[PDB]
Amino acid sequence: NLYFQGMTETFAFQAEINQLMSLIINTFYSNKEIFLRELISNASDACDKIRYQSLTDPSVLGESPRLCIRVVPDKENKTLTVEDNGIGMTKADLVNNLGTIARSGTKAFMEALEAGGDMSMIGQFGVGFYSAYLVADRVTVTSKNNSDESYVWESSAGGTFTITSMKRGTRITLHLKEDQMEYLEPRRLKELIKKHSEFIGYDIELMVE
Amino acid sequence: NLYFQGMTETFAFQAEINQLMSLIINTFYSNKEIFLRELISNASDACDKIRYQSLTDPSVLGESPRLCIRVVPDKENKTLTVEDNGIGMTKADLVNNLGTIARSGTKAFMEALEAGGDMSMIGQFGVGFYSAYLVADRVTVTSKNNSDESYVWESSAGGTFTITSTPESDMKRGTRITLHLKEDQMEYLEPRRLKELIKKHSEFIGYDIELMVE
Ligand SMILES: CO[C@H]1/C=C\C=C(/C)C(=O)NC2=CC(=O)C(NCCN3CCCC3)=C(C[C@@H](C)C[C@H](OC)[C@H](O)[C@@H](C)/C=C(\C)[C@@H]1OC(N)=O)C2=O
Numbered sequence: 001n002l003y004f005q006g007m008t009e010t011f012a013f014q015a016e017i018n019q020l021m022s023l024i025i026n027t028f029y030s031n032k033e034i035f036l037r038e039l040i041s042n043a044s045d046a047c048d049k050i051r052y053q054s055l056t057d058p059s060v061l062g063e064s065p066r067l068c069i070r071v072v073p074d075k076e077n078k079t080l081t082v083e084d085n086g087i088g089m090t091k092a093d094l095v096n097n098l099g100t101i102a103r104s105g106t107k108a109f110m111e112a113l114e115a116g117g118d119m120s121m122i123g124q125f126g127v128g129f130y131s132a133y134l135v136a137d138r139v140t141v142t143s144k145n146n147s148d149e150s151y152v153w154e155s156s157a158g159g160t161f162t163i164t165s166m167k168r169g170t171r172i173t174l175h176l177k178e179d180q181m182e183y184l185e186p187r188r189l190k191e192l193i194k195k196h197s198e199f200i201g202y203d204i205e206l207m208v209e
Numbered sequence: 210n211l212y213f214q215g216m217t218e219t220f221a222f223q224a225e226i227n228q229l230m231s232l233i234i235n236t237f238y239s240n241k242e243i244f245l246r247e248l249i250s251n252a253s254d255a256c257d258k259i260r261y262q263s264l265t266d267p268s269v270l271g272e273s274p275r276l277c278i279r280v281v282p283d284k285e286n287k288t289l290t291v292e293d294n295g296i297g298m299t300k301a302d303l304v305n306n307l308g309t310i311a312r313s314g315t316k317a318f319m320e321a322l323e324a325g326g327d328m329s330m331i332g333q334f335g336v337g338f339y340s341a342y343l344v345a346d347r348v349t350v351t352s353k354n355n356s357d358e359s360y361v362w363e364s365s366a367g368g369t370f371t372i373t374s375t376p377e378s379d380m381k382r383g384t385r386i387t388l389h390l391k392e393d394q395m396e397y398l399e400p401r402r403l404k405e406l407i408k409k410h411s412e413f414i415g416y417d418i419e420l421m422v423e
């Protein structure tokens with residue numbers, strides 16, 4: 001009907017991913033800061049993929065060819081955001097790869113941790129996105145791929161996530177936990193970005209508010 | 210997917226129904242108690258329509274052959290409910306008749322009030338449901354018709370309603386109307402108030418009305 005405004009779908013996580021979310025959100029791991037490197041790493045991969053598409057087909061860049069990553073603290077909303085103009089993600093991408101179908105890394109990473117491995121290796125296993133929950137109690141991912149409309153994924157690690165229906169790219173917004181408000185202070189962010197982005201080939205912009 | 214647990218669609222009300230809702234949720238009408246009579250009347254109607262269908266096809270009753278209306282106050286959630294095991298409503302029924310396709314009585318009832326008609330006449334116009342908002346700031350309608358799955362309609366008179374659908378078949382044939390009462394309308398949860406109100410307009414109700422103790 002003309003009067004329709006929106007739709008949200010709630011899905012359960014695949015069991016291993018649910019387990020990983022619980023473990024991460026509850027862990028006493030003492031080096032929580034690692035989340036940012038992972039989010040940035042993921043943006044760089046997103047940007048790489050659209051870049052490779054552009055080599056055969058320049059049109060994919062649209063009217064946004066300058067690829068780059070931006071970090072956005074928000075003291076008022078108590079949220080930190082990592083955004084990119086990379087390839088971005090379709091609904092299927094979000095539903096499949098960010099919830100319902102787990103790759104081999106979910107289990108392996110949990111098995112590595114059980115055998116005394118370190119949380120900082122999480123990226124290697126293809127599940128470092130989920131390190132957001134070390135500092136966050138809710139994560140909101142808004143993305144647009146050139147071949148789909150934009151969508152909003154959101155989860156509080158409560159066993160489920162929603163899918164609700166912007167320019168090409170992705171925004172990862174973290175609702176910070178009560179004790180993790182240090183990741184809104186700009187001096188902290190500057191030193192953290194510079195610590196692990198020596199070899200990221202895209203400019204990383206720290207937006208001031 | 211295996212993992213799908215529910216959907217909710219948000220619709221805007223058709224203009225005239227939105228107007229009716231604004232007016233009712235804001236009116237300074239004094240005799241707010243008339244809503245109960247109305248919701249009960251509606252439950253009676255639902256019961257009639259299935260009872261009738263059972264004369265030719267008795268299988269429609271399922272495993273609930275006794276048709277009746279129950280009234281459930283809830284002091285904790287601050288709600289009041291009117292249930293029935295009637296014919297129930299499909300998704301289309303809820304969306305069309307309870308949101309997006311206005312019947313002639315919507316505009317007409319408003320025109321009648323404009324010309325000095327009273328809010329107690331609302332039932333003649335086929336819009337007595339919306340009288341719930343005399344005493345409620347939110348209303349949730351849960352319904353199951355034999356031809357569809359269970360749906361949940363909800364609105365707070367903010368210009369929009371929702372239609373939610375879970376795979377969990379908790380519902381059996383019928384409908385439940387749940388009113389989240391306004392702060393100054395907590396008198397409609399006390400048993401002594403409900404007992405006198407039900408009796409006051411349920412002589413010509415052709416079914417049994419059961420007031421539930423919590
Ligand atoms: C919101 O983050 C990412 C989504 C899921 C990330 C997951 C669940 C993860 O934890 N690690 C992952 C990190 C990765 O780098 C990555 N892909 C590259 C991993 N590689 C390839 C070989 C070695 C490292 C995967 C595989 C797959 C989910 C790729 C994804 O879908 C198909 C898209 O091709 C890609 C454009 C999307 C992103 C990067 C998203 O990032 C933003 N901003 O777009 C991961 O699982």
Ligand SMILES: CO[C@H]1/C=C\C=C(/C)C(=O)NC2=CC(=O)C(NCCN3CCCC3)=C(C[C@@H](C)C[C@H](OC)[C@H](O)[C@@H](C)/C=C(\C)[C@@H]1OC(N)=O)C2=O
Pocket residue numbers: 248250251252254255258293295296297298302306307335336337338339384386
């Ligand atoms: C609380 O939900 C009610 C829904 C809408 C009520 C409306 C919009 C209303 O305000 N008045 C209305 C009261 C009515 O009595 C009635 N129809 C009956 C008209 N009469 C009155 C006496 C004999 C025939 C209509 C027309 C039409 C919406 C009927 C509806 O078509 C999907 C169903 O055939 C009917 C079974 C469902 C109910 C009544 C629901 O009642 C429960 N418990 O099931 C109304 O508009």
